[PDB]
């Protein structure tokens, strides 16, 4: 009697759950029956940044001086390597101010938006996002809570592999359908694993 | 901002940039609406030494708005109380006011 189609809605409602579960697991997957993500693997050498002084307090911080130091410290012979970060970090970067009042990037055009693909920064939104909900820039009780992920950088075409065997399938389950409840079944097979985890580094507060 | 230990409300260009770039890009492209006095307020800001933050010496800052997604409508509320309010050392800027919006 529906004035719609549950099925084609649900079929879409499962693939959306697969795509987001796969990508997330491939990042933070924990060992057994989930590919070990490179975050929890914790064999990427991790670089942590210094704290700053303010009115005697030793708040932790993250200055533009760090970002350039981090990106450039990649060994040249490993190859070209992109970077990954939650866009709230990139928003935190573009909005920095020098001593007097000028912006560091994009001096005087209301917005700083360079072509990412030329600065080798692929951007995402389900990374740990250090600036909690864009509310933890930091001068008092807004310090970054030292020990948070900020960005990562790696020669990805050799630092991590993602394997694929079969895309999703949907099969009616005759049996279990008790003449009230039509019951569908879906699944897929895939995996991933970390290759040489020397190509690749992690920044932290 | 603590103007000689007083903490008047304020709104400076650093806030406008951080507000517009925070919009999660997976929602699409978004336009910003605001009262024309606000856009005048941004255009007249000054750095500590006296220069202008926008158009470092032109007598005028007139950028392509449709290339910045700002869509002025002098029909929204403006925090400058028409004019002659907001942007002070002291005795102005109504805490709690409206400034601008942004959405798909």
């Amino acid at each position: 009697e529906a004035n719609y189609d549950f099925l084609s809605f649900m079929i879409g409602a499962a693939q959306r759950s697969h795509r987001i579960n796969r990508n997330q697991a491939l990042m933070i997957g924990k060992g057994v029956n989930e590919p070990k993500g490179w975050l929890t693997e914790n064999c990427f050498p991790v670089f942590q940044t210094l704290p700053v002084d303010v009115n005697g307090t030793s708040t932790p911080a993250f200055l533009a001086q760090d970002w350039r130091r981090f990106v450039t410290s990649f060994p040249a012979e490993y190859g070209e390597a992109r970077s990954v970060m939650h866009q709230n970090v990139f928003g935190y970067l573009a909005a920095m101010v020098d001593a007097n009042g000028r912006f560091l990037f994009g001096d005087g055009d209301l917005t700083f938006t360079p072509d990412l693909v030329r600065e080798r920064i692929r951007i995402s939104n389900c990374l740990p996002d250090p600036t909690e909900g864009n509310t933890k820039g930091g001068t008092g009780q807004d310090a970054f809570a030292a020990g948070s992920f900020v960005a990562a950088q790696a020669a990805w075409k050799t630092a991590f592999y993602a394997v694929e065997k079969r895309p999703m399938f949907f099969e009616q389950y005759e049996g279990g359908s008790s003449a009230w409840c039509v019951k569908y079944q879906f699944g897929a097979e895939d995996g991933g694993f970390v290759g040489c985890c020397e190509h690749g580094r992690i920044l932290q507060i | 901002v603590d103007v000689n230990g007083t903490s008047t409300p304020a709104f400076l260009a650093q806030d406008w940039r951080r507000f517009v770039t925070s919009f999660p890009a997976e929602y699409g492209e978004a336009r910003s609406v605001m009262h024309q006095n606000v856009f005048g307020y941004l255009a007249a800001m000054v750095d500590a030494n006296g220069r202008f933050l926008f158009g470092d010496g032109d007598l005028t800052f007139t950028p392509d708005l449709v290339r910045e997604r700002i869509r002025i409508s002098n029909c929204l509320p403006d925090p400058t109380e028409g004019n002659t309010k907001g942007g002070t050392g002291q005795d102005a800027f109504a805490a709690g006011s409206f400034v601008a919006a942004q959405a798909a």
Binding site: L50, V52, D53, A61, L63, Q65, Y92, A95, M96, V97, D98, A99, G133, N134, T135, K136, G137, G138, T139, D142 | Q14, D15, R18, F19
Partner: peptide, 20 residues
């Protein structure tokens, strides 16, 4: 949604010389 703050970075410059 409750009004969230928008804390942005202050004047951050230095990491090696404290002021007298």
């Amino acid at each position: 949604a409750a009004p969230s703050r928008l804390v942005q970075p202050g004047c951050f410059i230095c990491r090696g010389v404290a002021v007298s």
